[PDB]
Curated annotation (Swiss-Prot), chain A:
Name of the featured protein: Probable proteasome subunit alpha type-7
Residues of the full protein shown: 6 to 248 of 288
Misc: Present with 12000 molecules/cell in log phase SD medium.
A molecular function GO annotation: mRNA binding
Organism for this UniProt entry: Saccharomyces cerevisiae (strain ATCC 204508 / S288c) (Baker's yeast)
Subcellular localization, as worded in the UniProt entry: Cytoplasm; Nucleus
Swiss-Prot record, chain G:
UniProt gene name: PRE1
Lineage: Eukaryota, Fungi, Dikarya, Ascomycota, Saccharomycotina
Record bears the keyword Cytoplasm: yes
Purpose of the protein: Non-catalytic component of the proteasome which degrades poly-ubiquitinated proteins in the cytoplasm and in the nucleus. It is essential for the regulated turnover of proteins and for the removal of misfolded proteins. The proteasome is a multicatalytic proteinase complex that is characterized by its ability to cleave peptides with Arg, Phe, Tyr, Leu, and Glu adjacent to the leaving group at neutral or slightly basic pH. It has an ATP-dependent proteolytic activity. This subunit has a chymotrypsin-like activity.
The species this protein was found in: Saccharomyces cerevisiae (strain ATCC 204508 / S288c)
Modified residues (Phosphoserine): 76
Protein name: Proteasome subunit beta type-4
Transmembrane parts of this sequence: none
From Swiss-Prot, chain H:
Miscellaneous remark of the record: Present with 15200 molecules/cell in log phase SD medium.
Summary of subunit composition and partner proteins: The 26S proteasome consists of a 20S proteasome core and two 19S regulatory subunits. The 20S proteasome core is composed of 28 subunits that are arranged in four stacked rings, resulting in a barrel-shaped structure. The two end rings are each formed by seven alpha subunits, and the two central rings are each formed by seven beta subunits. The catalytic chamber with the active sites is on the inside of the barrel. Interacts with CIC1.
GO cellular component: mitochondrion; nucleus; proteasome complex; proteasome core complex, alpha-subunit complex
Protein name, per record: Proteasome subunit alpha type-1
Residue positions where Phosphoserine is found in the record: 227
Cell compartment(s), UniProt: Cytoplasm; Nucleus
Species whose genome carries this gene: Saccharomyces cerevisiae (strain ATCC 204508 / S288c)
Swiss-Prot record, chain I:
Family that this chain belongs to: Belongs to the peptidase T1B family.
Protein name: Proteasome subunit beta type-6
UniProt organism field: Saccharomyces cerevisiae (strain ATCC 204508 / S288c)
Signal peptide (residue range): none
Gene: PRE7
Source organism superkingdom: Eukaryota
Length: 243, 240, 235, 231, 250, 244, 195, 241, 111
């Protein structure tokens, strides 16, 4: 054996064990989700409060790319930031040459090809993050999830991290109960509920909720963070459902 | 470009590639340097498992770096050509910019620096060569003899030997060389050098090379018969 | 094998730690700082009696106000000294002044970690850098291949270092004269050296504000050796 | 074990051992503390010597007039990273006539450390940093880890026995956060914090290192007789 | 990133063998049989078209390739390796010869260039040797007809007749009994078909056999007229029908 | 990374030997023997082809003996492909010298440079050395007729008579026995063939398993001629000395 | 710079080169030696652009001396001249070409013959019985066409050379402050002190 | 045994990394099939969407490389998309450089040459994919050309790829033994698609809904994929016969 | 053709006393016959009790002052907050200027 010691080496199965090992780092991370809605997307993430000494609201994890795309990830946080930095470079060069802001499927493949490239050589390490991202373009709303291998698909709902299975189950119920569609404001509330429900798998430390959204009607197609009254309203909705 | 760090430290603080390069020197044919009152003599062993040699054209063991400095060595022959070439080029470059030939110390310092560079550069192995560099500084009559080794350290010697069985000939020189009175003449210096090689060599036939360097670019290589006379004379005094 | 810039499980760089072992094999070098000057002394340690000891150069001038002693793989020090001299002279060119001793030392230490897969391995030599400037006066620095440097009132490096350092702990005080420091280096060198200390196998040097960096003659050191033997017998 | 030869290799449980070994170098380092109020931010650092003949290794470095950090671990790595911060702060001033936000300073350090954890040949940085600063959104304290993880805090501590000070600050949180417009009291709280990490040794005059930045105070460092006030 | 493999992947073992070259020759041994025979007025090169699937169109896969109008090549071993070698070989005939001298290289020199390319895959950083042996047949004014074998090491040898691959040992022995220095091209084609039948197991017809000659100039295959000195390619690939005609009088 | 798969071709053994050079020499010891003999009026080059097949084209073939310029030739022992890389470099080097100085290159200078290239592959670059040993036979107006040999280490030496490749130990003993300094070319031709005939691993030495060449001043007045022997000429010289 | 001459006779090559170095309206020096010894039996004189001349001469000198040490042998005058020509032929298509004209006087010890080569800054080489660079040739060539014989002695060559210097001192516009004369023969290179 | 980690020869002349890349091909557990009509080339592939949270419209292994060329992949999606982006770039460059649309077989050769390089160069791993290129070439007509991690490529009368490829292959072989021709003797592409689905059903022994399949069709001057309803329309036609 | 230089006019003046020094300059800034500003200062406090003015082409003048101010900042960083003496500043400014010898800063500088 030894097939797992070097990136880009096929095992006799046809697998790249180093990528599968990066997936373990993602499974270790905190829970993050994405909900696709009527005219947009909603992102939420669990922020473990390690200590009283953490300044609330001041360790922001959700990231904006361009002015219309939001990105959240679970796993090695620095690796996610590297991926977003590239995403911002990719989006800038697309807007430079083609004028129009980068479409979400186009943006998805840019990240996909870049992450896939880090499975081609033994001189680089695969990314230790699964990234949930999306936004609104000329063809409406899109939600994506990208994994260490470079694999990505479009999603109705997406979840990753330590509480992914709990969150996935909760997401599947929403898809079944709302075939016509979920509204942006509703999806924000649901995101809060799901993060609180997915927190059961990480319940030693209590946490801080962080939500963002892009909606054609509610945010005018731009990425914004949910703060103040709309955040507290979403927190209260979530608190009522766990009890 | 090939980048591998081949010379690295080991847990005990040794650089094995440098130390193994010293073993290549230990395998090489013996070379000796002795400096007199007014000269330096470089003696070199030539192994006799090679008959049918052509001595006219075969590379000589002692090389002129400039008209006033010479270089002999022990170790890998192919490696030594690279050091000699670089030294010869630096010799001409020094004359060009400083308008004065190199001092023996300077030429030695340059050669040693090259050797050192190959001990902490990626993709290269150290030189499997130790050198004896002898000569006279411009407009100076004080004899100079220096030694370098793969690590890059260099130093001055009243007399020194390198190569196989060098520890035996160093032993000889350590009791037979008086610091208070170095070989007063050319004859005395050549004899002490030939004597020291005869402790290790075999036959004093076509096994010993002797090169004499005197002040003001006066370098000459002795022929077989000339050396053979020293061999004949030493043996007759020995039977006593 | 393994990467040259690899960390051990204890959080140390293998190659840096191994180069420290090479330095322990080196010949002893001692430095003492006073308000009248800084003294630098080294053990020459000739491998054979035929080797002309005065060609052993382990104390070296960097500038008029900065001197340097070495211990370990001394061939590795050549490019360090070359850099130090260029740094010192370059600073004088750019700023029409002497460069601070600390700034010089920091510049030399910047070379240290420039290895990996830059040079192929760390340096196998430690340096004692002694000098004077107008701001911080007489200073002594110990520069390691880790890239770290400490200021010292007194410091020994090499094979006899831990024994000599313990001796320096007892002997050093803030009122030592230059002459007292000279004798103290000789005394402690004689203690840790293998062969018997004399003017041919040990070398002294100092840096003073007035006369700058000077390597002592074998005649001058011999008298200090004689003055030292007489004083120890005198009680 | 078999997966700690370099940073480019994941372990079967998804760990990067070279990064973890770099983290270990910080734990061996001398303790340093960081804390802030709404008006000032304070660094306190315990300096370490080789022996009684040596100087005490300086732990605090100034990055700009409004920013600086303290270090724990490999000091040369702190010099490289602080130099990078000095340049980034400087670029912001020359190009945009703008003081670099302490938050951006954190993001830049994170991304610099990260690149050293994904490529062959390189190594992680072997030092932890506590960055303090005062910018357009008031006082700040950051904690840098060479894994890339940067974290904004009211107070914290890194190094050997840092857990004592970190617990103390966690208790004192409500008190020291409201020490506004009083530098000497915020330092006193930081000096009392670092005292919870001492063993057999106490704070002396050439042992203690304090730094402060705030509303009407440039980033300045105190050593020697200037810290005698606080012992 | 970047190719960090700047070191040799083929090195000498204590016994003196070059492992990767030996192993490359082993890959050639596994390969399907190909052969070449030199006549007085031409050269023939032949091989079996091993089909991967009956749904595959074996006409789209050419084992015998034109390099210049007077030079052709066939192989045994790894197909993909051969394909890129043909690309490189065709280009080097232009860049290092035709663009300089205004004429096509003689067989021996083109062979020499291909051999160089294969030698470099034996010494350069981060590459394995080519897993093929080539047989190159060709004609040029001052050397006449010639036939060469190129091995993974980069070595090449001139042959009167030879075979490489699966059943090369038996095929070489067969050729030794039949070859004389008075063979006419048609006689050499006949012997090539006989020799190949021994190593072929399944169907033996013009669709499973690939065969080309180096013979007379073909003015009808030139594509233009008006230049007396240009008389057409000496390389010609025999059609499926042309092979079957000769298999009746076998 | 890629460190895992690096053979480290340019390192020392604990004994101070270069692994790859030693192993390349071991490879060369299985190659067909080549002999060079230097006479007072010329030089002989003789070499044994590696086990021949009857269907090999013998006349249009070159394996052992190559022409570097009009005054210098080489006999090869080792990988032919490796040798041709070096031969082309040597050919270009000779022309560079002629272009620069308007004089044919002195033999040693050409030998040194080719040997310096080999040396480089043993000290840097992480590549395998060239598995080749050369016998250089040539003439210049400084030293006249010269024989040299170089091997993968990049070390070269001059000879009166020398062998490379297989059975050098036995071949050298035989040459050392019958060689004398006042020897002529035609005598040297006979010695070369007699030595190969006794050291050969084959049953009997025939024309088709040999390459032969002479470098004489046997042109017309004060000029040197290179004669690469044709098959029939080797057949005749083999009969003339009574080997067949 | 300005005046450099060369005459090949039976047994030697004689080079004469002007001693003046003029910049602007000032003769800065009147004892300048516009020559370099490349090897024991090879001498090169030079004239042309300020700085370029000595820089090129010493560069060639360094290379020939390097060759001598490497091979323990002296290159023939023909070989040295070809090396020098090629260096100038390279130079002429460089970003900044050497503007230097040279004469190479040598004694071939293998042939026992004197040899004189004239090479201009373009790399135009010719072997000649007598040579000159610059405006000097416009007087000396015709003079030598008349008085030169191929079998002359070194003394006859010096008298023939005196005739050239006299003509130049009579008809040339500039004061070139006389010449330094050097002889190249079987015994090497020596300078005539009283000319 | 480091000869199994990089693309160098094993003692028996094999490249294990190439062989293991072939096994990565079946990691998706999807079977593909390609056939030729008179006027068209049809390619079909299974579509398995296990997760309910996936957007099914974004799950695809068929790619439109150019206006005329289509490509279906057997293997993981990251490598599949890597190959697709390169193929698109190569086909675009070819058109710019040479003034005409890149033929299907030429693109196949080019992608096969790239794959060959990864089998010879050490720093680059092979892509764990098999690429089936389809078109109606303006010179050669309906065309199917297929590439693998070894760098091998060849034209096909018809072909299949995936875990249960052998069953589909023989099924097609037996049809062409019977029909005695190189293609599907049918006028419309609609019925050639129907043939393709019919013979996949017979070989695999499974029934398909509209969301269990994925269809690409190449005609003169365009390659296009079918919607769920286009396939449903096609499934209804098969059922009513 | 584009001309990278311009002339912004104005004039400056420096006088030194026994324990003081003055550096004066008018506040007018011009191009051709137009006034750009009646108050645009070109005499600057650069720290360490050094005042500086680079008068001529203002873009080059500002660039130089900017670079020297930055040089003072890094001098502190690299040499333990040591005060940059006026003689050391002068030598440093020489190198700033000569570094652009073949594309000069078009200014008369006084400190
Ligand atoms: Cl291609």
């Amino acid at each position: 054996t030894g097939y797992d010691l070097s990136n880009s080496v096929f095992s006799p199965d046809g697998r790249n064990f180093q990528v599968e090992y990066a997936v373990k780092a993602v499974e270790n991370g905190t829970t993050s989700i994405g909900i696709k809605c009527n005219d947009g997307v909603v992102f939420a993430v669990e922020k473990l409060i390690t200590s009283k000494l953490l300044v609330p609201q001041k360790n922001v994890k959700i990231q904006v790319v361009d002015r219309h795309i939001g990105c959240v990830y679970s796993g090695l946080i620095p690796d996610g930031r590297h991926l977003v930095n590239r995403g911002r470079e990719e989006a800038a060069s697309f807007k430079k040459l083609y004028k129009t802001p980068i479409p979400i499927p186009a943006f998805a493949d840019r990240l996909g090809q870049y992450v896939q490239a880090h499975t081609l050589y033994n001189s680089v390490r695969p990314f230790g993050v699964s990234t949930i991202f999306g936004g609104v373009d000329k063809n409406g709303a899109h939600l994506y999830m990208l994994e260490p291998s470079g694999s990505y698909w479009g999603y109705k709902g997406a979840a990753t991290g330590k509480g992914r299975q709990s969150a996935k189950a909760e997401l599947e119920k929403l898809v079944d109960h709302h075939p016509e569609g979920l509204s942006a404001r509703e999806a924000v509330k649901q995101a809060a509920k799901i993060i609180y429900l997915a927190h059961e798998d990480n319940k030693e430390k209590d946490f801080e909720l962080e939500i963002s959204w892009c909606s054609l009607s509610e945010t005018n197609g731009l990425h914004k963070f949910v703060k103040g009254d709309l955040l507290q309203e979403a927190i209260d909705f979530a608190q009522k459902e766990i009890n | 470009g090939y980048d591998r760090a081949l010379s690295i430290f080991s847990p005990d603080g040794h650089i094995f590639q440098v130390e193994y390069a010293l073993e290549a020197v230990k395998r090489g044919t013996c070379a000796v340097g002795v400096k007199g009152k007014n000269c330096v003599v470089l003696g070199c062993e030539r192994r006799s498992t090679l008959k049918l040699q052509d001595t006219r054209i075969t590379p000589s063991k002692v090389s002129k770096i400039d008209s006033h400095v010479v270089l002999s060595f022990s170790g890998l022959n192919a490696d030594s050509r690279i050091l000699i070439e670089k030294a010869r080029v630096e010799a001409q470059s020094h004359r060009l910019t400083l308008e004065d030939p190199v001092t023996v110390e300077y030429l030695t310092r340059y050669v040693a620096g090259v050797q050192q560079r190959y001990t902490q550069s990626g993709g290269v192995r150290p030189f499997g060569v130790s050198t004896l560099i002898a000569g006279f500084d411009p407009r100076d009559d004080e004899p100079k003899l220096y030694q370098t080794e793969p690590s890059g350290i260099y130093s001055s010697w009243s007399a020194q030997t390198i190569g196989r069985n060098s520890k035996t000939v160093r032993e000889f020189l350590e009791k037979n060389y008086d610091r208070k009175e170095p070989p007063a003449t050319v004859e005395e210096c050549v004899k002490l050098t030939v004597r020291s090689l005869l402790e290790v060599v075999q036959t004093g036939a076509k096994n010993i090379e002797i090169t004499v360097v005197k002040p003001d670019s006066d370098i000459v290589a002795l022929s077989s018969e000339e050396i053979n006379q020293y061999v004949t004379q030493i043996e007759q005094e020995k039977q006593e | 094998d393994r990467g040259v810039s690899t960390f051990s499980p204890e959080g140390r760089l293998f190659q840096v730690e191994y180069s420290l072992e090479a330095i322990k094999l080196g010949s002893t070098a001692i430095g003492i700082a006073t308000k009248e000057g800084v003294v630098l002394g080294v053990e020459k340690r000739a491998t054979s009696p035929l080797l002309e000891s005065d060609s052993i150069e382990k104390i070296v001038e960097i500038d008029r106000h900065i001197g340097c002693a070495m211990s370990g793989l001394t061939a590795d020090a050549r490019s360090m000294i070359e850099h130090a001299r260029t740094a010192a002279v370059t600073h004088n060119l750019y700023y029409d002044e002497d460069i601070n001793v600390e700034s010089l030392t920091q510049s030399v230490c910047d070379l240290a970690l420039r290895f990996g897969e830059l040079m192929s391995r760390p340096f196998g030599v430690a340096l004692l850098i002694a000098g004077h400037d107008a701001d911080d006066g007489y200073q002594l620095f110990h520069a390691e291949p880790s890239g770290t440097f400490y200021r010292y009132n007194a410091k020994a490096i090499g094979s006899g270092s831990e024994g000599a350092q313990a001796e320096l702990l007892n002997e050093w005080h803030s009122s030592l004269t230059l002459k007292e420091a000279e004798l103290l280096v000789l005394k402690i060198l004689k203690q840790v050296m293998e062969e018997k200390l004399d003017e041919n196998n040990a070398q002294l040097s100092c840096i003073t504000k007035q006369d700058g960096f000077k390597i002592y003659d074998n005649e001058k050191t011999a008298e200090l050796i004689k003055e030292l033997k007489e004083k120890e017998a005198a009680e | 074990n078999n997966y700690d030869g370099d940073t480019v290799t994941f372990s079967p449980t998804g760990r990067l051992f070279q990064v973890e070994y770099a983290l270990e170098a910080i734990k061996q380092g001398s303790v340093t503390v960081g804390l802030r109020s709404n008006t000032h931010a304070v660094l306190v650092a315990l300096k370490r010597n080789a022996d009684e003949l040596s100087s005490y290794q300086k732990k605090i470095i100034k990055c700009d007039e409004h920013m600086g950090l303290s270090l724990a671990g490999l000091a040369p790595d702190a010099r490289v990273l602080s130099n990078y911060l000095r340049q980034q702060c400087n670029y912001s001033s020359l190009v945009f006539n703008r003081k670099l936000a302490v938050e951006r300073a954190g993001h830049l350090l994170c991304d610099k450390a990260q690149k050293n954890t994904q490529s062959y040949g390189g190594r992680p940085y072997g030092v932890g940093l506590l960055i303090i600063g005062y910018d357009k959104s008031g006082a700040h304290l950051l904690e840098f880890q060479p894994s890339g993880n940067v974290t904004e805090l009211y107070g914290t501590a890194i190094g050997a026995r840092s857990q004592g000070a970190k617990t103390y600050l966690e208790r004192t949180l409500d008190t020291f956060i409201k020490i506004d417009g009083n530098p000497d009291e915020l330092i006193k709280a930081g000096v009392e914090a670092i005292s919870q990490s001492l063993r057999d040794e106490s704070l002396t005059v050439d042992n203690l290192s304090i730094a402060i930045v705030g509303k009407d105070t440039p980033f300045t460092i105190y050593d020697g007789e200037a810290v005698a006030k606080y012992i | 990133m970047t190719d960090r493999y700047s070191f040799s992947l083929t090195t000498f073992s204590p016994s003196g063998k070059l492992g990767q070259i030996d192993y490359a020759l082993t890959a050639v041994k596994q390969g399907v049989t190909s052969l070449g025979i030199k006549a007085t007025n031409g050269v023939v090169i032949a091989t079996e078209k091993k089909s991967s699937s009956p749904l595959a169109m074996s006409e789209t896969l050419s084992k015998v390739s034109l390099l210049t109008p007077d030079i052709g090549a066939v192989y045994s071993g790894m197909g993909p390796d051969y394909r890129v070698l043909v690309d490189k070989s065709r280009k080097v005939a232009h860049t290092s010869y035709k663009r300089i001298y205004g004429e096509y290289p003689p067989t021996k020199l083109l062979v020499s260039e291909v051999a160089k390319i294969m030698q470099e895959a034996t010494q350069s950083g981060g590459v394995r040797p080519f897993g093929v042996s080539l047989l190159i047949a060709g004609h040029d004014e001052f050397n006449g007809f010639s036939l060469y074998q190129v091995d993974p090491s980069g070595s090449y040898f001139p042959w009167k007749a030879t075979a490489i691959g699966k059943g090369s040992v038996a095929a070489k022995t067969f050729l030794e009994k039949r070859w004389n220095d008075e063979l006419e091209l048609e006689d050499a084609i006949h012997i090539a078909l006989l020799t190949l039948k021994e190593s072929v197991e399944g169907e033996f017809n013009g669709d499973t056999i690939e065969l080309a000659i180096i013979g007379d100039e073909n003015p009808d295959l030139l594509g233009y007229t008006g230049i007396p000195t240009d008389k057409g390619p000496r390389f010609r690939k025999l059609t499926s029908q042309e092979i079957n005609d000769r298999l009746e009088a076998l | 990374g890629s460190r895992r798969y690096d053979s480290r071709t340019t390192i020392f053994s604990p004994e101070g030997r270069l692994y790859q050079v030693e192993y390349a020499l071991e490879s060369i010891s299985h190659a067909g023997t080549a002999i060079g003999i230097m006479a007072s009026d010329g030089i002989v080059l003789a070499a044994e082809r590696k086990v021949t097949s009857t269907l090999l084209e013998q006349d249009t073939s070159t394996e052992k003996l190559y022409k570097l310029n009009d005054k210098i030739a080489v006999a090869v022992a080792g990988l032919t492909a490796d040798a041709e890389i070096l031969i082309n470099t040597a050919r270009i080097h000779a022309q560079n010298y002629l272009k620069t100085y308007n004089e044919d290159i002195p033999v040693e200078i050409l030998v040194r440079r080719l040997s310096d290239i080999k040396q480089g592959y043993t000290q840097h670059g992480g590549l395998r050395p060239f598995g080749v040993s050369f016998i250089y036979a040539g003439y210049d107006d400084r030293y006249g007729y010269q024989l040299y040999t170089s091997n993968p280490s990049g070390n070269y030496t001059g000879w009166k008579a020398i062998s490379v490749g297989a059975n050098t130990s036995a071949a050298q003993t035989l040459l050392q026995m019958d060689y004398k300094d006042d020897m002529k070319v035609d005598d040297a031709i006979e010695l070369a063939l007699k030595t190969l005939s006794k050291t050969t691993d084959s049953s009997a030495l025939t024309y088709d398993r040999l390459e032969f060449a002479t470098i004489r001043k046997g042109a017309n007045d004060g000029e040197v001629y290179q004669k690469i022997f044709k098959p029939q000429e080797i057949k005749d010289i083999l009969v003339k000395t009574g080997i067949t | 710079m300005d005046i450099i001459l060369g005459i090949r006779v039976q047994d030697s090559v004689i080079l004469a080169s002007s001693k003046a170095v003029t910049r602007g309206i000032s003769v800065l020096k009147d004892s300048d030696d516009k020559t370099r010894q490349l090897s024991p039996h090879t001498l090169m004189s030079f004239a042309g652009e300020a700085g370029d001349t000595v820089q090129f001469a010493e560069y060639i000198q360094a290379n020939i001396q390097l060759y001598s040490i490497r091979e323990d042998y002296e290159l023939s005058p023909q070989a040295v001249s070809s090396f020098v020509r090629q260096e100038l032929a390279k130079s002429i298509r460089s970003r900044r070409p050497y503007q230097v004209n040279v004469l190479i006087g040598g004694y071939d010890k293998k042939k026992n013959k004197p040899e004189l080569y004239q090479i201009d800054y373009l790399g135009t080489k010719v072997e000649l019985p007598y040579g000159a660079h610059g405006y000097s040739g416009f007087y000396t060539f015709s003079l030598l066409d008349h008085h030169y014989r191929p079998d002359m002695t070194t003394e006859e060559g010096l008298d023939l050379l005196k005739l050239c210097v006299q003509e130049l001192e009579k008809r040339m516009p500039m004061d070139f402050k006389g010449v330094i004369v050097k002889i190249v023969d079987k015994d090497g290179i020596r300078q005539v002190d009283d000319f | 045994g480091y000869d199994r980690h990089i693309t160098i020869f094993s003692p028996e002349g094999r490249l294990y990394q190439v062989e293991y890349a072939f096994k990565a091909t079946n990691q998706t557990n999807i079977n593909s099939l390609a056939v030729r009509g008179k006027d068209c080339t049809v390619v079909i592939s299974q579509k398995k969407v296990p997760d309910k949270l996936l957007d099914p419209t974004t799950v695809s292994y068929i790619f439109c490389i150019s206006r005329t060329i289509g490509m279906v992949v057997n293997g993981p999606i990251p490598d599949a998309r890597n190959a697709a982006l390169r193929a698109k770039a190569e086909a675009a460059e070819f058109r710019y450089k040479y003034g005409y649309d890149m033929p299907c077989d030429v693109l196949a050769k080019r992608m096969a040459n790239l794959s060959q390089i990864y089998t010879q160069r050490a720093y680059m791993r092979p892509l764990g994919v098999i690429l089936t290129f389809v078109s109606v070439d303006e010179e050669l007509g309906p065309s199917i050309y297929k590439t693998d991690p070894a760098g091998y490529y060849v034209g096909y009368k018809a072909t299949a790829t995936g875990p249960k490829q052998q069953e589909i292959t023989t099924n097609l072989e037996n049809h062409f033994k019977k029909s005695k021709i190189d293609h599907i003797n049918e006028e419309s592409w609609e019925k050639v698609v129907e043939f393709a689905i019919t013979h996949m059903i017979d070989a695999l022994g499974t029934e398909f809904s509209k969301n269990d399949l994925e269809v690409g069709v190449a005609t003169k001057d365009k390659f296009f994929t079918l919607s769920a309803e286009n396939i449903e329309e096609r499934l209804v036609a098969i059922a009513e016969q | 053709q584009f001309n990278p230089y311009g002339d912004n006019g104005g004039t400056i003046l420096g006088i030194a006393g026994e324990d003081f020094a003055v550096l004066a300059g008018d506040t007018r800034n011009i191009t051709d016959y137009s006034i750009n500003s009646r108050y645009e200062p070109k005499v600057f406090d650069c720290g360490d009790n050094i005042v500086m003015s680079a008068n001529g082409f203002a873009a080059d003048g500002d660039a130089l002052v900017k670079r020297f101010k930055n040089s003072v900042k890094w001098y502190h960083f690299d040499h333990n907050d040591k005060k940059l003496s006026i003689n050391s500043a002068a030598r440093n400014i020489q190198h700033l200027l000569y570094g652009k010898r073949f594309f000069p800063y078009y200014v008369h500088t006084i400190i």
